[PDB]
Amino acid sequence: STGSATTTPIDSLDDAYITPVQIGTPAQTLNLDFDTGSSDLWVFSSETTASEVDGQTIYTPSKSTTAKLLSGATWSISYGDGSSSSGDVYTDTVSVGGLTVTGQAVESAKKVSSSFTEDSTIDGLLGLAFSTLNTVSPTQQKTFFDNAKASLDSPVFTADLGYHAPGTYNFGFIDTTAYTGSITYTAVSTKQGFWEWTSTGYAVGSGTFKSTSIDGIADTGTTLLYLPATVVSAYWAQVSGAKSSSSVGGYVFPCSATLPSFTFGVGSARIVIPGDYIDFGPISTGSSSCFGGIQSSAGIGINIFGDVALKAAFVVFNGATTPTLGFASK
Numbered sequence: 001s002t003g004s005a006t007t008t009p010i011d012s013l014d015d016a017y018i019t020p021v022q023i024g025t026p027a028q029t030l031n032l033d034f035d036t037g038s039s040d041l042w043v044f045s046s047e048t049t050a051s052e053v054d055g056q057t058i059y060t061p062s063k064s065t066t067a068k069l070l071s072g073a074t075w076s077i078s079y080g081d082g083s084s085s086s087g088d089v090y091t092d093t094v095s096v097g098g099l100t101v102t103g104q105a106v107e108s109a110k111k112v113s114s115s116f117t118e119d120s121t122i123d124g125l126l127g128l129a130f131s132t133l134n135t136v137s138p139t140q141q142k143t144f145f146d147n148a149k150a151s152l153d154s155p156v157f158t159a160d161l162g163y164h165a166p167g168t169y170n171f172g173f174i175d176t177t178a179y180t181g182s183i184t185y186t187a188v189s190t191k192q193g194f195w196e197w198t199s200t201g202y203a204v205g206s207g208t209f210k211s212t213s214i215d216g217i218a219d220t221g222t223t224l225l226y227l228p229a230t231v232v233s234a235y236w237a238q239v240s241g242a243k244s245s246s247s248v249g250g251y252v253f254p255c256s257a258t259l260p261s262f263t264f265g266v267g268s269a270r271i272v273i274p275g276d277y278i279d280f281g282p283i284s285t286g287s288s289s290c291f292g293g294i295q296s297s298a299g300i301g302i303n304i305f306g307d308v309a310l311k312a313a314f315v316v317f318n319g320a321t322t323p324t325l326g327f328a329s330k
Contacts, residue, residue, distance in 0.1 A: 001151045002172035003099025010121040015223050022095040024064030030057050030123035035221030039133035039143050040077050042107035043124035052112050055120030067092045075107045075136045083115040099171050101148050105141035133193035155319045159220055161311035179314035179328035184269035188323040197325050204235050205260030216303030225308040226297035235294050248283055251292040266327040273312040
């Protein structure tokens with residue numbers, strides 16, 4: 001089997017991407033944030049504290065003939081940005097782009113933090129990291145991908161995120177028309193439960209490539225590119241007037257600037273992030289100070305190849321017995 005679904009930016013900045021997901025019988029379609037940095041599929045639901053729901057579409061398990069309470073199971077998750085959610089668990093039929101899993105754990109939110117409430121466009125998350133990170137207790141549950149894997153034509157999914165435009169998540173096949181050149185594959189460590197890999201270095205603009213190992217995660221659920229302070233300083237030093245602002249919470253730059261590109265290494269290959277991808281616009285409405293798309297990972301504890309980086313590539317998440325990641329230009 002295979003599946004193919006379009007993923008769409010939630011706003012004009014590409015802050016996140018939503019993908020329609022069918023849950024239950026008859027289908028209830030919710031728009032979920034596919035997150036290769038976590039491993040829970042959770043939704044706003046009829047059980048979510050009413051004051052914490054503001055415009056989201058909810059899953060109502062009582063209206064699904066295939067929903068079953070997973071008795072005794074609870075979940076609770078905290079994300080890197082400080083947001084969180086928790087609740088109980090149903091199993092139900094879940095389909096993405098024509099690919100159906102029966103008996104998928106669907107984690108129903110009883111509580112969500114303010115950032116989720118305030119984002120009316122995101123009805124929940126669909127985790128695509130390794131199932132060892134799943135938070136369901138006392139019986140850990142499998143991700144949608146893990147459940148689908150055996151049935152897929154090939155044990156892979158791909159992320160093809162757009163810049164200010166829709167893109168695609170495919171399951172079970174590699175669309176050879178979706179990228180240019182060849183796909184370069186690189187080793188993955190699953191030790192921390194992430195799609196963790198080591199970039200071979202970077203360049204700023206038309207500058208020379210610096211060969212240096214940068215361990216990080218491929219994370220579709222993180223907006224920006226978070227890299228070591230040394231790398232980030234070297235980038236922003238090429239932008240007149242750019243500075244790190246503790247009050248704003250990162251590097252900012254004059255909105256009048258033209259940003260240089262940023263290149264990262266994948267083995268001997270190179271992925272170029274155009275400068276415009278690094279512009280996250282005014283820090284506040286009407287400001288002439290703009291927020292940068294490359295930020296320091298110092299004090300996160302991990303480097304994160306978030307959407308800024310991934311949307312410059314066609315990315316293969318290979319879930320074979322020995323997992324790997326592939327990157328192609330597009």
